[PDB]
Design a protein around this ligand. Sequence first.
Ligand SMILES: CC(C)C[C@H](NC(=O)c1cc2ccccc2s1)C(=O)N1CCN(C(=O)[C@H](CO)NS(=O)(=O)c2ccc(Cl)cc2Cl)CC1
Lengths: 127, 587, 101
Amino acid sequence: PFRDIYYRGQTSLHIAIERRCKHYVELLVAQGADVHAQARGRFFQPKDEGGYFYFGELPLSLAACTNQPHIVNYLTENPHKKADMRRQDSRGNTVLHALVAIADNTRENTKFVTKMYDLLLLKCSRL
Amino acid sequence: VFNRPILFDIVSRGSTADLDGLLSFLLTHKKRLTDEEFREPSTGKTCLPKALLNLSNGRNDTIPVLLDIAERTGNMREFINSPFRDIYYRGQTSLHIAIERRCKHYVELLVAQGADVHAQARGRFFQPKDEGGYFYFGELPLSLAACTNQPHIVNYLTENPHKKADMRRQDSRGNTVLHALVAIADNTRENTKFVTKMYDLLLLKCSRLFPDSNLETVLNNDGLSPLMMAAKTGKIGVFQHIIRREVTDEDTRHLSRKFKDWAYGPVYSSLYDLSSLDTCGEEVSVLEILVYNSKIENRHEMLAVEPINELLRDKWRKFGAVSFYINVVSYLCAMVIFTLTAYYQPLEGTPPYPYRTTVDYLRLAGEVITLFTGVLFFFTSIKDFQLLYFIYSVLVVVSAALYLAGIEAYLAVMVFALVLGWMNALYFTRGLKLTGTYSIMIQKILFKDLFRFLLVYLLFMIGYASALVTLLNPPACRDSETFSAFLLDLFKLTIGMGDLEMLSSILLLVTYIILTFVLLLNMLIALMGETVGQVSKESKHIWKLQWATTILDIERSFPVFLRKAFRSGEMVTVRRWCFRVDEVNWS
Amino acid sequence: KDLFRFLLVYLLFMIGYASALVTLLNPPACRDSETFSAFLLDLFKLTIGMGDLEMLSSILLLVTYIILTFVLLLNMLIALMGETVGQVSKESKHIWKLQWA
Ligand SMILES: CC(C)C[C@H](NC(=O)c1cc2ccccc2s1)C(=O)N1CCN(C(=O)[C@H](CO)NS(=O)(=O)c2ccc(Cl)cc2Cl)CC1
């Protein structure tokens, strides 16, 4: 975990997913990584509160907001430790509320948000 | 041969057959190919441009015969670089003609044989369209090959193994290819497409040859450089690209302006360089040129460029907004002091210095403060919209001057300064709450209404008075004695509040006064019609441009070199005072 | 909007015009004997509302200055007229929907 205020708890899993490279993310997760990492940092708060990017403060939500369908599939279907979609955050958003925190009126942004948002509910309901 | 026209006709038609054997009499008469017989009296046009002027699908095969003939004549140097002597043309060597015909085939042959590449078409025709010339291209073959969208020739003309022209070579106005390449730039999409394309081509080429300095460093006689010249001439197309100039090649990456600092998933933070947009007053800056210049044509959209709109807003947040509110409140209190000071100004007549009371001292302070701000304004007006401001400074100075002498009946200027002071106050109040549309409406109606009306106003005075004297030798207006002023006031109330006695208190006078009524009414309606259509809802842009004026107006006020500076940047490999901008994209 | 744009000009001219007035008089037309400016205030209240202002004809700067308040007052009303017409927006057909709900 980082110790800054401009960053915090940004475990290696956060970096690996954000680079949009599942190749090392799965390797990192398989070896055993804290999937319930909490990027409780100033940079990670909404644009209104001084942070540039809010994504739910969870790798699962980070993999969700950033439009990473394959990693969210694996990160919840991986045989090793996995994150429950219900896992809340500082504001209790969970992936669904956070996935709406990055939603935008732009056509393309709403396209994957609504797409993946449906993906999560179907996944969560079955489990 | 026997006469010049036949030689010109023969070469123009491209017939080398009859051209053969002419060398016989050239040697026999020892006449040089550049002699007066081969040159026009006025233009001095030589066979070369004449032959090149009639380029027949790139098949003008008469040129090498002349080149071979020139070699035989023993005078080949002057033959190639043949300068015209007109005013409508000048120095238009054969190289200029060859390139302009968009035929590199003969240009390379001409250059290879040796031509004055640094030719200077210093002619009337070649000046900008504003100065009587139809085409300006930098006044150099390299710039001529650049402006005319000739990529292959500019590549060769600078990469040719023989003599080549350095891109830094200046001209009469010191433009060089880059400034000239911006002199032909146009807002049209296609024109900006090759200009920006080839403009980048030149910088990359110049940088590799001369890594010490980028080509934009060289300044024209006016002292602008491309970006400023594009800024001063309102070339949005080129300009909006120059600021966003990013070069991938590492050796030539340094000459970029839109870096890429970092990205956190879908948020990007491009680190724009603005080494020219803000010089802290050390040197002229694009931002100052872009707002404090009236000749600009595209100001509203030019400000919209990324590190310009954000840059102004950044100044607003820190040291642009607080100093604005310190200005409104401090200035408003100054006038209120002037208002109260004037109101309670010492009564009882003859107030040289009647201050012998506690409240009198407070009034004395009010007069002193207004006197101080009156002269303080004077220094900041001479140091440099300041018109009303300048009039305030002298008038308040005039007031205290007469007062200090204890001379009565000269509070007139002091009060008239006050009304101007509050008229001056229109400036600051404009910059907040999207105000100032009042100010724009005032000036547009100011000049118009007065002389449309006063024309009609006095038009009817004499017109109607002269008809009036028919009934009377000057009663209703002036009993006994000949005046027309009382008639003037009569009309002043006829429309303002009516109640005109007229001579009922003969019919033509009744009919004529009807015209002034209907004429006056519709003019007011037309004035009403003019104003409504003139509002334009501010176009949402006048405030933006006018607002930016306030921020920069404040910045030049206090010493910028102090800790009022935009963000700094790294030292080397990317010591440039860069500025940060952050944009989020989900693509 | 209207109130403090006008009342600013309204009191702006009271003192501005009264101070120019005392040049002719130590305080007649507005207040014979004794120094008040309120009667001047009402004088302007009628100058535009219904006219009929006596002024001191009942020196020229006072005539010129009272011309400014007139032209300044008139165009401000025109600008106020200009502001209102552009502000109507025909309700945009949406304010009623939201307000009705
Ligand atoms: C922080 C200040 C040192 C910056 C500087 N000074 C002032 O503003 C003032 C000086 C004083 C002195 C006595 C009473 C009142 C004031 S207000 C400054 O800001 N500038 C310098 C040149 N300028 C001026 O000299 C006038 C400033 O009054 N220009 S103005 O038309 O009257 C004006 C006034 C307020 C605002 Cl919102 C904008 C403007 Cl266009 C303009 C810009």
